[PDB]
Amino acid sequence: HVDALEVHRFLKGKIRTALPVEKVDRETLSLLYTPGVADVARACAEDPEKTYVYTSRWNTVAVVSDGSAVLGLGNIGPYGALPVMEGKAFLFKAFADIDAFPICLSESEEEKIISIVKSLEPSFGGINLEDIGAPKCFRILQRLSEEMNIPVFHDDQQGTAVVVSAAFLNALKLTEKKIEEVKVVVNGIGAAGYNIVKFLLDLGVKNVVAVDRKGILNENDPETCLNEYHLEIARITNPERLSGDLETALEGADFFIGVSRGNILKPEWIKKMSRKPVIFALANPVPEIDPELAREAGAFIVATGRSDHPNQVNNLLAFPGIMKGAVEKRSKITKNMLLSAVEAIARSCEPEPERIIPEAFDMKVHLNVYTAVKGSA
Amino acid sequence: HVDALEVHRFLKGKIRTALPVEKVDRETLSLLYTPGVADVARACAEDPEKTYVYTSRWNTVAVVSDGSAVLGLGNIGPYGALPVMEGKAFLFKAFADIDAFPICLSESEEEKIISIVKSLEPSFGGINLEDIGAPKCFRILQRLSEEMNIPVFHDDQQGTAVVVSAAFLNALKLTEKKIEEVKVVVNGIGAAGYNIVKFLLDLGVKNVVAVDRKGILNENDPETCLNEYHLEIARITNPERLSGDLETALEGADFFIGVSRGNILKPEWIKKMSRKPVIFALANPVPEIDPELAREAGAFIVATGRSDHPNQVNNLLAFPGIMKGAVEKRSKITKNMLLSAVEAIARSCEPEPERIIPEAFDMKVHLNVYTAVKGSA
Amino acid sequence: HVDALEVHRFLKGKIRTALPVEKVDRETLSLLYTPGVADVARACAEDPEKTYVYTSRWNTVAVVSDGSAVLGLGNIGPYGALPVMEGKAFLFKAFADIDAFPICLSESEEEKIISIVKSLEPSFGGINLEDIGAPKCFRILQRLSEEMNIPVFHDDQQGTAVVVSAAFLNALKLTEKVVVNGIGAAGYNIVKFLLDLGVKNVVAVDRKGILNENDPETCLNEYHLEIARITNPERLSGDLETALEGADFFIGVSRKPEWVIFALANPVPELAREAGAFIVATGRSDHPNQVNNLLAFPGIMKGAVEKRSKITKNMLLSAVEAIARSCEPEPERIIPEAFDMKVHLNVYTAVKGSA
Amino acid sequence: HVDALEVHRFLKGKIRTALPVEKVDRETLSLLYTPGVADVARACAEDPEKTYVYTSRWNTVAVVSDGSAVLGLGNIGPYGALPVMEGKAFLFKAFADIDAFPICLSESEEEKIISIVKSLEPSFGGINLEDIGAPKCFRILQRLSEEMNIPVFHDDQQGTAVVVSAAFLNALKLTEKKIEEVKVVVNGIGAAGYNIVKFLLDLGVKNVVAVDRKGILNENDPETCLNEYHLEIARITNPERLSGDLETALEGADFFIGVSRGNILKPEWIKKMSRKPVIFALANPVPEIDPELAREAGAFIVATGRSDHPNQVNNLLAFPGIMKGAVEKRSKITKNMLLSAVEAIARSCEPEPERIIPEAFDMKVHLNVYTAVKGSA
């Protein structure tokens, strides 16, 4: 009977601050505050880059949310978001030694978020956008990364894409199929899906069939398009010009990657997919199909977003290293950096069907991602 | 002999974060992050007050500046401000065990600042405005404290006024004069001066005479009104309707409180003030008159802003206790609470001419301030 | 309603260490380890006092126990004592900012304990003996405090006596002007404080009755003999009931109603309310009027370590007075609670000032 | 001009403690102290292994010295040792997250040290003996590791031997010679030398030649045997039954390993060693021969104990992982565990002449050593 609530109540928060020194005397204050701190102020005004030498800015990250898409719970707001962003901050400290600080905003208009986060630049070495709904989060990420001079990263977009891509590459190796030749069905084209399709295409997949809640995205019957972003996905997708529902998409498919809803992939559809079919059922918290059921129906490899099962595709393998690398580099996160991360995660294990990527507590992963990202232009 | 710069470089910042637990395993994450943290999110969304029980909000404070008036250096900006705000955060932790975090903004238009800070409400239990220039900081303070539901406190305004008030009360006790009957000259109607005038009035002084760089403030010599705030001060000031320069003001005055520029009060003017005259010459870093010189010219009590001399009037006596009390009470900071603090500081020692207030390393002071503020809320 | 065990399990201890710096690079190591640290070594070897300037010694305290008298549980040993010493260390940091560290020893012969603790002198600025049984703890305290040159303090003797004395003085004030039961570590020292304070009729009682040199059965060691010699005015004698009959005060380190009550045994002695009777003090962090060491040790240790001298009668009585003056006594609150920070500041100030 | 002394003074120590929780109230005490702690006390008395579950014992280590052999300084005592043991503790935390405490003893008779440290067993998960002179440290290590049920490790003996061994294996590989055929001269048979000899023999070296102040160790020249431990070494070394000084020993030698004094190996001797000679000159702080001088005289590979030069053979690569592994395993440190560490360090890089082992800041090493040690007998 050890409750998450009980333990939060007892800890009164997961976020501590802490002093460099124990004793605080006249001399200490004259150094760390007035009058000595004036010199450090003069220095940082004359040259902002010197904040990276004389303050904590070289290692501080803002975890920014308006709570418009918290976990699986939806748009619950900044107050609901706060304990979740404290948890992320805790993870940042524990897995990367990054001093992360939750910034939960009571503003949800795009343009306003964007100008608020821009204003924080002097205070942080990096920005981690988290649990901000789609499609606004597409514009918010693009704008802030383009206009800020510290790295800006959105887990549910770039993190998921990185880890899905590394899993995909290893499953594909096990499958023994050519990347240019496989048919990959991606279902659920919100933040993750949009970015997954883009990774898959950069990597070499040529036949990506995208699907969302009114079917396969197709210019020619464009009832298939909630958003402009789905427009963009059909322009670069579905080479065979297929049309119909998920079930139709899966005919002959080699991979299904779902970042969508629970229990929607029926088991008999697996038998209409190609031989040695791979199923990434990452809907949170209930996967698109139950993993055992999928195994029983013939799946070669099954992955989910849960720690309950083997082959957990989890953002945690990505964000510590990426953020650490990017913040040290001090520049914009680039495609090359994200693909270095993909490759690092992938090579961080010898793939087997029951283990196509490492687990997050394997500290070598975080090291290798860090290194990969630090080293890339 | 150690440099402020060298030690900052070595420390790479004065701000740490730190974790509740050492070991981080599957179980710990299931409690402090997913899935357990979803319960906590649901509870805080349902009732935002619960952030005070389940997160660090009960003890976190944002130290907010745009760097428009840093220490004695002026409008150097948010980067120069950062190491200073780090210093302030250090002090909050050391003297009140408050987890303070610097928020240095690259926005300096007053309406934009206001709206940025408002949006941060969910992430903090209190706001400490710091080193924001006058006159914009008057409106900023007023608006944020009226519109936010966590306390907002600006040191240079409210802290200085609190300490100056407590100093004034004790000095007045030692002088043996009636508050209704004394003439008090306040010179320099900026951040501090403005607020010092208002406190003195709230306290019961009747003859306050305000002075700035174009002379005594009087509604009928409109030259003397450099903004709307000076006009406001002129309208609640100067009962005898006096007109002229600082020298004229001081004729018969009992107190001079200067928060202005260096070596401005000529020693011979002291002899034209009333008997047992009191001189708070708080201009930083050079006082309005040299303290020994003022003693020599007949000053009964002399106080400055420096540690160099007896009677250091410094904000540090005020902000720890006030902020701790206010965040705990969760309410807006009120005239009551500020006056509690004044009285608690004043009663924190037995006044004599060379010691009219306590030193800031006397930890009884911070406890008494804290207790006073907690109790009037 | 979270369990003490479950939370100890989740915390995996109440003791952390922590680094001054975050980033650790070639430069940092060259300053804090080799080769820079050799200069600091040379300096401390040439002058041991410099450990107070260059190391954490100025603020570290060893919390020493063999587990021979743990809380109310008895001689459970060093392993049972460990989570308790961890608690005491936690309190030391919380209430005095002292970096305390548990030293639970698997040795219980007194001369060996004494020489082990002596050998630790270079590593600490102070020693807090804790939960070591009587009567060996009387010799252990005296020897270590006489032979070491850092302060050594034993809670259950000096801390309990301080707090009991402050409680007593305030209770006496409310009374508008004394039986001590259980003459172990605490009782012994409680008796002597009450005498130093001015009480004339102290009556000491232990498991064989009221201590009277003329009834030799009542003298379980030399120390009870000593107490019998400076206690009991109407040279009276018998068990407790006779001991307590029409009684100024009852003070117990212990385990009928009819005859001010500090009953301070772990769990209880002897209605602790609704059986009448004016003032009622527990040991518990549970009920009104808790007489606990916590009010004393933080401040006393902080003061003593800073003054660097041996703890004296004067310093302990400072503490007694500072705790007693730390509130306005009313029957339901004859002393402050431990989380009133003012108390620890006042104790610290008092002890510093009498050093 | 930034001094080690100045910085130590400013930090007033490198050791902090820190609390799990920030606020302390009635409820907290009732859980972490009386009366709740009594249940934890009962549990640990009933079963001492439960200290690993309910206290910090699972992760605390005593750093034990009497200061009989501090750094390169000698027998300076426990006060001189203290700032050094604080440094070691700081390393333990930084590289392994181990909570290490300095225990510097004012007792230096060996039996007395032994009984003191045994008495501390309930308070620690592990013992790190440090800077205790030879030959008493031989008996001290052996007795404590035999008699205690927490691991006991002495750096200068076991750590130095582990790192020297890995360096040796990699150097040997680069050399392309067979381990059973090389002549290896070890000079300075103190805490390190004794153990280095024994590891090399375990590893497969057959011609090890031990040398100390009175010459090559040889039972037949009894002068050469300064204690029983040198006699022991003489009996398992020097198969060719050589006799004479270091210079004689080096004729035809393939490796020199010195853990002795500065500037004793003359450059021209290198030319009488075999082809592609390897020189580990680890005397601290001045090497047995200047490294450049050695290169200039024909050395194929040169290593020292300093960070000043390539190929730093330093204990830091070994102790964090070893201690962490051992303390978690809870059992006695074994020969298999130490050889796993040797292998793990060696494989943690691709050896080249200018880099035969990794540097300590390569965090992969510490992970690999930890894994190796945790996994072995």
UniProtKB/TrEMBL annotation, chain C:
InterPro entries: Aminoacid_DH-like_N_sf, Malate_Decarboxylase, Malic_N_dom, Malic_N_dom_sf, Malic_NAD-bd, Malic_NAD-bd_bact_type, Malic_OxRdtase, NAD(P)-bd_dom_sf. (S)-malate binds at residues 266, 292. Residues 157-355 form the Malic enzyme NAD-binding domain. NAD(+) binds at residues 160, 181, 185-186, 206-207, 254-255, 266. The keyword Zinc applies. Divalent metal cations. Prefers magnesium or manganese. It comes from the Bacteria. Residues 12-145 form the Malic enzyme N-terminal domain. The active site is at 33 (proton donor), 88 (proton acceptor). Its cofactor is Mg(2+); Mn(2+). One of its GO terms (molecular function) is metal ion binding. Signal peptide: none annotated. Zn(2+) binds at residues 130-131, 156. Keywords: Metal-binding, Nucleotide-binding, Oxidoreductase, Zinc. A divalent metal cation binds at residues 130-131, 156. PANTHER family: NADP-DEPENDENT MALIC ENZYME (PTHR43237). Belongs to the malic enzymes family. This is Malate oxidoreductase.
